[PDB]
Amino acid sequence: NDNLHIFLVCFIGQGVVNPMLRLGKAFASKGLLVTLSAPEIVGREIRKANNLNDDQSIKVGNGMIRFEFFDDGWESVNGSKPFDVGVYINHLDQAGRQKLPIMLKKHEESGTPVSCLILNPLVPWVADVADSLQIPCATLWVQSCASFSAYYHYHHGLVPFPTESEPEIDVQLPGMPLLKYDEVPDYLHPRTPYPFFGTNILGQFKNLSKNFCILMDTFYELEHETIDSITKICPIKPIGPLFKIPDCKEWLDTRPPSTVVYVSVGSVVYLKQEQVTEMAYGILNSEVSFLWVLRPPSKEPHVLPEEFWEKAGDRGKVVQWSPQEQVLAHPATAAFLTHCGWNSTQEAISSGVPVITFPQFGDQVTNAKFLVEEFKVGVRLSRGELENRIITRDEVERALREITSGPKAEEVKENALKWKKAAEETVAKGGNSERNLVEFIEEVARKTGS
């Protein structure tokens, strides 16, 4: 697979960059030439997060990933204004239609012509450029297949969704459990504060059929009923869990196995002080052992109760940052109170750690449904920010208690074990996800020699 050049185009944001980077390593391990391109406005963040070589590359086992940071024109256009992602995505669309063909032509000249373009739903113009340059392209879907099917059926108007006239109706999609109005990815709900986030993702479905493949970071055993339904309409290939393809640590090493509740919701939201207070007292009144990642005041205080520090004793630890993948694989970790982002969901499923669902917005509310009612590894704490209420300390203590001892805690712990074995199996040699990855590479090879 030497002659094969996979060229990935990131949007802005850890939620897109890390899945794309992980996929790029999946291709680099297999011996392909891989280029990860990303807008320069996130260029210094990406370049510090992984040390680039003197050719701006990283080693990935046998292969390597070259990094390519392109000018979106943004600083010159935007001046002193604050960053507005809605303005930015539409600007990057216009810029990238002109920039990408230029980067593609450069790779022809370097003797490394691009074999396949891989985009994501936030840069769907990449497929239009691919189409006019006769270059194959796939898109990486970075949410669940359940979330894919919701946006797909919304965009095509195939089933009624909550509207302004009818805001709390259920939605029944093919191959899926019934979705309550507030379990649809809620950027699609009329009440969302973020209608533009919905419009950006729906942007992918205007020209989705220009992609010969839709790679997805899930695996077949996790969503088999939805996959077996949607693949009759869309060329979806599950290739995940992507992250499993081949201070905090020293404090957990001293806890007994399966006793620490890992609490981290702040990677997508800054909570109100009032909610932080109820979380802190629920953590104390539950008496469980905990590791709490508490977002710092970016300089709303996130102050903890006076008693909290004395009452937490040796059982607790509060930190500013944590290596989430390391914590979730640690023996001491017993449960994950999470915002249920799709990456967090996949990491808990694949690490064998039951969850307490604290979703905030977007697909988090859909993932939370599946974690509790479908994957059956979760205890429900909230229904999302659209509910627009503070989760009280008593509800917080109930979730912590329900996940750590009793029949519900035993059912979710053993279900989490089954999911962990399934997720390991699907990326090992012979697994469904690893075979989809080999087949994807074979499909690109057949298009290169055509």
Q: CA-CA distance, 184 to 160, in Å (whole number)? A: 12
- What's the start-to-end Cα distance of the chain, in Å? 16
Secondary structure class of 356 (helix, strand, coil): strand
- From residue 412, give the alpha-carbon distance in Å to each of 61, 324, 415, 417: 35, 20, 5, 9
Domains of the chain: 5-244+429-448 (3.40.50.2000), 248-424 (3.40.50.2000)
Say how far apart CA 87 and CA 240 lie, in whole Å.
32
Letter string b/e over residues 242-271, b meaning 16 or more CB atoms within 10 A of that residue's CB: bbbbeebeeebeebeeebbbbbbbbbbbeb
User: What whole-number distance in Å separates Cα of residue 23 and Cα of residue 142?
Assistant: 11
Contact indicator for 28, 55 with CB cutoff of 8 Å: no
- By the 8 A CB rule, do 161 and 184 touch? yes
* Dihedral over Cα of 192, 198, 199, 200: its sign: positive
Under a CB-based contact definition with an 8 Å cutoff, are residues 30 and 442 in contact? no
| Rounded (5°) CA angle 394-258-261 | 35
The two beta strands, 316-319 and 236-238, are unpaired
The whole-angstrom separation of Cα 231 and Cα 236 is 6
**Burial zone of 340 (CB within 10 Å; 0-12 exposed, 13-18 middle, 19+ buried):** buried
Asked if the peptide bond before residue 241 counts as cis, ω within 30 degrees of 0, the response is yes
Neighbouring C-alpha atoms within 13 Å toward the C-beta of 421:
5
* Secondary structure of residue 203 in the 3-state scheme: helix
Assigned token pair, 179: 């979705």
Query: CA–CA separation, 117 vs 9, rounded Å?
Result: 8
Report how this structure was experimentally obtained: X-ray
Cα–Cα distance for residue pair 445/151, rounded to 1 Å = 31
Distance CA 330, CA 37 (A): 33
Q: Are 398 and 408 in contact (CB under 8 A)?
A: no
Are 177 and 306 spatial neighbours (Cβ–Cβ below 8 Å)?
no
Distance CA 173, CA 229 (A): 10
Q: Which helix (H) or strand (E) holds 9?
A: strand 5-9
The shares of helix, strand and coil residues in the chain, as percent rounded to the nearest 5, are 45, 15, 40
Q: What is the DSSP letter of 42?
A: G
Q: Are 263 and 279 in contact (CB under 8 A)?
A: yes
SS3 state at 328 = helix
Query: For residues 416 and 377, what is the distance between their CA atoms, to the nearest angstrom?
Result: 6
Q: Where are the alpha helices (DSSP H) in 79-121?
A: 85-109
Q: In a 3-state reduction of DSSP, which class is residue 137?
A: strand
The dihedral through the CA atoms of 387, 390, 395, 397 has a sign that is: positive
In whole angstroms, what is the distance from residue 178 CA to residue 176 CA?
Answer: 6
Residue where the block lists tokens 């090992």: 428
- Give which of 203, 209, 235 is closest to 124, Cα–Cα: 203
What the block records as the tokens of 342 is 């799709």
H/E element holding 292? Answer: strand 289-293
Give the span between the Cα atoms of 35 and 60, in whole angstroms: 12
How do beta strands 260-264 and 333-338 pair? parallel
Matching residue, tokens 């390597």: 64
Instruction: Compute the CA torsion angle 220, 226, 227, 228 (nearest 10 deg).
Output: 110
d(CA 208, CA 138): 9
Q: Which amino acid is at 110?
A: S
Q: Where are the alpha helices (DSSP H) in 195-317?
A: 195-202, 224-230, 248-252, 273-286, 306-311
Question: Angle, nearest 10°, between helix axes 14-29 and 342-351?
Answer: 50
Tokens, residue 141? 């879907």
Residue with tokens 């935007």: 78
Strands 137-141 and 213-216 turn out to be parallel
For 5: left if phi > 0, alpha if psi spans -120 to 50, otherwise beta; the answer is beta
206, two tokens: 């205007």
Please say whether the beta carbons of 174 and 149 come within 8 A.
yes
What is the rounded distance in angstroms from the CA atom of residue 82 to the CA atom of residue 220?
42
